[PDB]
Design an enzyme around this catalytic site. Structure first.
Site, PDB file in Angstrom:
ATOM      1  N   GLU A 187     -33.034   3.087  15.634  1.00 30.86           N
ATOM      2  CA  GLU A 187     -32.024   2.908  14.564  1.00 30.86           C
ATOM      3  C   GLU A 187     -31.576   1.435  14.468  1.00 30.86           C
ATOM      4  O   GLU A 187     -31.459   0.887  13.400  1.00 30.86           O
ATOM      5  CB  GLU A 187     -30.804   3.833  14.746  1.00 30.86           C
ATOM      6  CG  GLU A 187     -29.868   3.781  13.550  1.00 30.86           C
ATOM      7  CD  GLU A 187     -28.408   4.178  13.879  1.00 30.86           C
ATOM      8  OE1 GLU A 187     -27.853   3.684  14.893  1.00 30.86           O
ATOM      9  OE2 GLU A 187     -27.847   4.974  13.094  1.00 30.86           O
ATOM     10  N   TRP A 216     -31.075  10.225  10.724  1.00 36.56           N
ATOM     11  CA  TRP A 216     -30.630   9.962   9.354  1.00 36.56           C
ATOM     12  C   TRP A 216     -31.165  10.967   8.311  1.00 36.56           C
ATOM     13  O   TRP A 216     -30.785  10.892   7.141  1.00 36.56           O
ATOM     14  CB  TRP A 216     -30.831   8.487   8.962  1.00 36.56           C
ATOM     15  CG  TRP A 216     -29.774   7.494   9.549  1.00 36.56           C
ATOM     16  CD1 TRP A 216     -29.867   6.784  10.705  1.00 36.56           C
ATOM     17  CD2 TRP A 216     -28.518   7.119   8.961  1.00 36.56           C
ATOM     18  NE1 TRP A 216     -28.729   6.004  10.895  1.00 36.56           N
ATOM     19  CE2 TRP A 216     -27.894   6.193   9.836  1.00 36.56           C
ATOM     20  CE3 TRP A 216     -27.858   7.483   7.783  1.00 36.56           C
ATOM     21  CZ2 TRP A 216     -26.663   5.605   9.555  1.00 36.56           C
ATOM     22  CZ3 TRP A 216     -26.637   6.914   7.508  1.00 36.56           C
ATOM     23  CH2 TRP A 216     -26.037   5.983   8.407  1.00 36.56           C
ATOM     24  N   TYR A 259     -26.363   0.634   6.603  1.00 35.50           N
ATOM     25  CA  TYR A 259     -26.197  -0.626   7.339  1.00 35.50           C
ATOM     26  C   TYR A 259     -27.238  -1.707   7.124  1.00 35.50           C
ATOM     27  O   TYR A 259     -26.895  -2.885   7.149  1.00 35.50           O
ATOM     28  CB  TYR A 259     -26.017  -0.388   8.858  1.00 35.50           C
ATOM     29  CG  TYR A 259     -24.792   0.386   9.114  1.00 35.50           C
ATOM     30  CD1 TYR A 259     -23.548  -0.230   9.023  1.00 35.50           C
ATOM     31  CD2 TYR A 259     -24.842   1.761   9.379  1.00 35.50           C
ATOM     32  CE1 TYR A 259     -22.381   0.486   9.172  1.00 35.50           C
ATOM     33  CE2 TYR A 259     -23.660   2.494   9.565  1.00 35.50           C
ATOM     34  CZ  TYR A 259     -22.430   1.819   9.463  1.00 35.50           C
ATOM     35  OH  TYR A 259     -21.250   2.476   9.638  1.00 35.50           O
ATOM     36  N   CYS A 306     -18.406   3.697   8.680  1.00 36.08           N
ATOM     37  CA  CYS A 306     -17.514   3.881   9.815  1.00 36.08           C
ATOM     38  C   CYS A 306     -17.457   2.615  10.637  1.00 36.08           C
ATOM     39  O   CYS A 306     -16.440   2.334  11.240  1.00 36.08           O
ATOM     40  CB  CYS A 306     -17.993   5.052  10.694  1.00 36.08           C
ATOM     41  SG  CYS A 306     -17.923   6.652   9.778  1.00 36.08           S
ATOM     42  N   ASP A 331     -16.076   9.883  15.842  1.00 36.55           N
ATOM     43  CA  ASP A 331     -16.224  11.243  16.487  1.00 36.55           C
ATOM     44  C   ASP A 331     -16.413  10.905  17.921  1.00 36.55           C
ATOM     45  O   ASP A 331     -17.479  10.401  18.322  1.00 36.55           O
ATOM     46  CB  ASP A 331     -17.484  11.971  15.963  1.00 36.55           C
ATOM     47  CG  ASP A 331     -17.640  13.468  16.476  1.00 36.55           C
ATOM     48  OD1 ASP A 331     -16.984  13.943  17.461  1.00 36.55           O
ATOM     49  OD2 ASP A 331     -18.477  14.191  15.833  1.00 36.55           O
ATOM     50  N   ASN A 390     -22.564   4.924  19.401  1.00 39.18           N
ATOM     51  CA  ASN A 390     -21.968   3.660  18.828  1.00 39.18           C
ATOM     52  C   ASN A 390     -21.798   2.596  19.886  1.00 39.18           C
ATOM     53  O   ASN A 390     -22.176   1.452  19.701  1.00 39.18           O
ATOM     54  CB  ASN A 390     -20.628   3.942  18.184  1.00 39.18           C
ATOM     55  CG  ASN A 390     -20.707   5.004  17.105  1.00 39.18           C
ATOM     56  OD1 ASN A 390     -21.778   5.235  16.515  1.00 39.18           O
ATOM     57  ND2 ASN A 390     -19.590   5.693  16.867  1.00 39.18           N
TER      58      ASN A 390
HETATM   59  C1  15C Z   1     -19.853  12.100   6.329  1.00 40.63           C
HETATM   60  C2  15C Z   1     -19.617  11.930   7.808  1.00 40.63           C
HETATM   61  O1  15C Z   1     -18.578  12.323   8.321  1.00 40.63           O
HETATM   62  C3  15C Z   1     -20.667  11.298   8.691  1.00 40.63           C
HETATM   63  C4  15C Z   1     -21.189  10.020   8.450  1.00 40.63           C
HETATM   64  C5  15C Z   1     -22.168   9.467   9.284  1.00 40.63           C
HETATM   65  C6  15C Z   1     -22.670  10.154  10.399  1.00 40.63           C
HETATM   66  N1  15C Z   1     -23.604   9.674  11.259  1.00 40.63           N
HETATM   67  C7  15C Z   1     -24.815   9.139  10.976  1.00 40.63           C
HETATM   68  O2  15C Z   1     -25.314   8.949   9.810  1.00 40.63           O
HETATM   69  C8  15C Z   1     -25.525   8.772  12.232  1.00 40.63           C
HETATM   70  C9  15C Z   1     -26.739   8.203  12.526  1.00 40.63           C
HETATM   71  C10 15C Z   1     -27.050   8.005  13.878  1.00 40.63           C
HETATM   72  C11 15C Z   1     -26.232   8.352  14.962  1.00 40.63           C
HETATM   73  C12 15C Z   1     -24.993   8.929  14.749  1.00 40.63           C
HETATM   74  C13 15C Z   1     -24.094   9.307  15.896  1.00 40.63           C
HETATM   75  C14 15C Z   1     -24.603   9.157  13.331  1.00 40.63           C
HETATM   76  C15 15C Z   1     -23.441   9.718  12.597  1.00 40.63           C
HETATM   77  O3  15C Z   1     -22.410  10.169  13.217  1.00 40.63           O
HETATM   78  C16 15C Z   1     -22.106  11.432  10.599  1.00 40.63           C
HETATM   79  C17 15C Z   1     -21.134  12.008   9.788  1.00 40.63           C
HETATM   80  O1  UMP Z   2     -21.671   5.856  13.084  1.00 41.81           O
HETATM   81  C1  UMP Z   2     -20.826   6.752  13.087  1.00 41.81           C
HETATM   82  C2  UMP Z   2     -20.644   7.465  11.920  1.00 41.81           C
HETATM   83  C3  UMP Z   2     -19.704   8.478  11.919  1.00 41.81           C
HETATM   84  N1  UMP Z   2     -18.935   8.774  13.017  1.00 41.81           N
HETATM   85  C4  UMP Z   2     -18.014   9.923  12.740  1.00 41.81           C
HETATM   86  C5  UMP Z   2     -16.512   9.687  12.783  1.00 41.81           C
HETATM   87  C6  UMP Z   2     -15.969  10.685  11.764  1.00 41.81           C
HETATM   88  O2  UMP Z   2     -15.852  11.990  12.309  1.00 41.81           O
HETATM   89  C7  UMP Z   2     -17.042  10.757  10.711  1.00 41.81           C
HETATM   90  C8  UMP Z   2     -16.703   9.882   9.496  1.00 41.81           C
HETATM   91  O3  UMP Z   2     -16.124  10.659   8.443  1.00 41.81           O
HETATM   92  P1  UMP Z   2     -14.977  10.026   7.519  1.00 41.81           P
HETATM   93  O4  UMP Z   2     -14.035   9.530   8.540  1.00 41.81           O
HETATM   94  O5  UMP Z   2     -15.659   8.986   6.715  1.00 41.81           O
HETATM   95  O6  UMP Z   2     -14.316  10.978   6.620  1.00 41.81           O
HETATM   96  O7  UMP Z   2     -18.232  10.357  11.392  1.00 41.81           O
HETATM   97  C9  UMP Z   2     -19.139   8.041  14.215  1.00 41.81           C
HETATM   98  O8  UMP Z   2     -18.562   8.197  15.292  1.00 41.81           O
HETATM   99  N2  UMP Z   2     -20.075   7.037  14.214  1.00 41.81           N
END
Ligand code: 15C
Ligand code: UMP
Ligand code: 15C
Ligand code: UMP
Lengths: 312, 312
Positions: free
Chosen positions: B60, B82, B146, B198, B221, B229
């Site tokens: 990634e 993704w 990104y 994020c 999260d 991250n």
């Molecule tokens: C819409 C939303 O909440 C959301 C946005 C982005 C992600 N999200 C990714 O695209 C992604 C790609 C690679 C690793 C992780 C840990 C994540 C991730 O958490 C997950 C949820």
């Molecule tokens: O690279 C990322 C992308 C997303 N999140 C998690 C945090 C939130 O739970 C969610 C983002 O949702 P919104 O906060 O945009 O509503 O994804 C991460 O920890 N790392």
């Protein structure tokens, strides 16, 4: 006491700061990544250990909040903190015909009689900006400063967005959004603009009816700027909370590089002598709500009891 | 131990988190403004208390670093993190003719036989993206993620800027700049785009030949995302340091809203049972320097000894 994090930051840079060279005197002592938290229910974090002029903070903030970038509004409130960057665009210009200054400010501290010519030219500029509409449009307008990034961000379509206004509508409708962000950092402008914003971005957060705000500040003059910065964003937080009908939570102040200039060292040391007093209280017009039309009179500071200013 | 700040964050949200409602299960427990610091000279902060897949992090990151937004590159490395956002643009489309899913993922956990249809459709999509150039251009391309914000930021003139590349040239020439910032937050895109970033912005800092990096992450999260991250940005910091010929300093991880989902609570609790082990070490190709052409093989992780993964 409410302001102790400020004094801990000063002390930490004194004790554990790293030296670096730059400009405007020999260099800096700095640290990276520091955070300060202020519980706004305990009082208002205007520094008691050194007098900080709340009228200049109020008027600067209202200026940003109108989306205004013209120093004329600030001049009408006897606020000269943005003057030099405006003066600078006029002095460096073809329309200007007075005694020359390739680098005032630097030379203004040296001479006690060039400081005489400069302060007259500047006084003249201030007056022409106040009374000459066209001169003001041309030289009073700073262009890309906070009022435009916050409230008139320039799009690819040659349109304009009100980031702060849109965020405030979101706080009212979607208070738990994790997207309540205003940014002042524009990758397109930042490599040529005169002043890439120090107050890079901020974010709101709501819990239990309380509004918090975190500011990411990429670069900070701990002595001169940070005490104004803390009070602007604390006031911003109160005003937004008022509009939205919320209580205030925390203001969190996060830094990239926070620094002390190598010649401000004794000034900050003497301030570390002083003992914080109880914090002032803020009062906002209880019957007015759109902060984009707040004026000077709608904001009051009660019981502010500061030590003297340190002219440094 | 190197990873304790992660475990302190988890525990602090458990003990002092504020409940809020949202979506994807009942709601969250969260805090605002937390910071984690990791001294990268002590080892590499990939979590030992739960296995985190370093190959998916490496690929990634290299993907972002090529300025690439097409999942095809990630598929070629067996990295599916993704996929769903790409799959989603294709499923919601007019070109698509298979068993319908108005809201997969949600329904995918319920059924043990809709999860059968979905995983086949997704497997098919993955294959068409891998082997059909035009299908890939249309559906493989995530658009504003990104790789584009970091390396191809879209200007008002319909031009494009390489923020990260320009910052890296500045680190080499002006290491003490307080302007070493890459932002992923574009006020013009952010109100309509599928995924407002994020990982909002980050900043470099140099002192005594060591490179540090601070990330401002608006939303996190804590269980699923934060451990990935932390390792992406730590690796980013090592790679940039390598290009520039510097040592590594600190990675500082700063949050807006950091949250635990109300159904991840027992998973994180069991992880709090486990005792960190000594940290892995990173090895980078000692004779290659432009990280924008690094590949999988140029990055090695030594002595990684994790507890098992927690499938949650
Ligand atoms: C819409 C939303 O909440 C959301 C946005 C982005 C992600 N999200 C990714 O695209 C992604 C790609 C690679 C690793 C992780 C840990 C994540 C991730 O958490 C997950 C949820
Ligand atoms: O690279 C990322 C992308 C997303 N999140 C998690 C945090 C939130 O739970 C969610 C983002 O949702 P919104 O906060 O945009 O509503 O994804 C991460 O920890 N790392
Ligand atoms: C170029 C530079 O370093 C620099 C940039 C901005 C400012 N700067 C202002 O415009 C300004 C306005 C009002 C208050 C303060 C405390 C400041 C300030 O510190 C000062 C210096
Ligand atoms: O609102 C502001 C504006 C500036 N500064 C100080 C911090 C730095 O000393 C300087 C910014 O210069 P650069 O970091 O951009 O080079 O101004 C503040 O504290 N607050």
């Amino acid at each position: 006491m409410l302001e102790q994090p400020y004094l801990d930051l000063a002390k930490k840079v004194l004790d554990e700061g790293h030296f670096k060279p730059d400009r405007t005197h020999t260099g800096t002592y700095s640290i990276f990544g520091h955070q300060m938290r202020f519980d706004l229910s305990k009082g208002f974090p205007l520094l008691t250990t050194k007098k900080v002029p709340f009228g200049l903070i109020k008027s600067e903030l209202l200026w940003f909040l109108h989306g205004d970038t013209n120093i004329r509004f600030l001049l009408q409130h006897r606020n000269h903190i943005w003057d030099e960057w405006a003066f600078e665009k006029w002095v460096k210009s073809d329309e200007y015909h007075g005694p020359d200054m390739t680098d005032f400010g630097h030379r203004s501290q040296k001479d006690p009689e060039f400081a005489a010519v400069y302060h007259e030219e500047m006084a003249k500029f201030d007056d022409r900006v106040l009374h000459d509409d066209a001169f003001a449009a041309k030289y009073g307008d700073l262009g890309l400063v906070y009022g435009s990034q916050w409230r008139a961000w320039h799009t690819s379509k040659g349109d304009t967005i009100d980031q702060l206004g849109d965020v405030i509508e979101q706080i009212k409708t979607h208070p738990y959004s994790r997207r309540l962000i205003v940014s002042a950092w524009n990758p397109e402008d930042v490599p040529t603009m005169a002043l890439p914003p120090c107050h890079t971005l901020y974010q709101f957060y709501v819990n239990d009816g309380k509004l918090s705000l975190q500011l990411y500040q990429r670069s900070a003059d701990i002595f001169l700027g940070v005490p104004f910065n803390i009070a602007s964003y604390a006031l911003l937080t109160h005003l937004v909370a008022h509009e939205c009908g919320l209580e205030v939570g925390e203001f969190i102040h996060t830094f990239g590089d926070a620094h002390l200039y190598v010649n401000h060292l004794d000034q900050i040391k003497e301030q570390l002598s002083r003992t914080p007093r109880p914090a002032p209280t803020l009062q906002l017009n209880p019957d007015k709500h759109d902060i984009f039309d707040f004026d000077m009179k709608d904001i009051k500071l009660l019981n502010y009891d500061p030590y003297p200013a340190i002219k440094a």
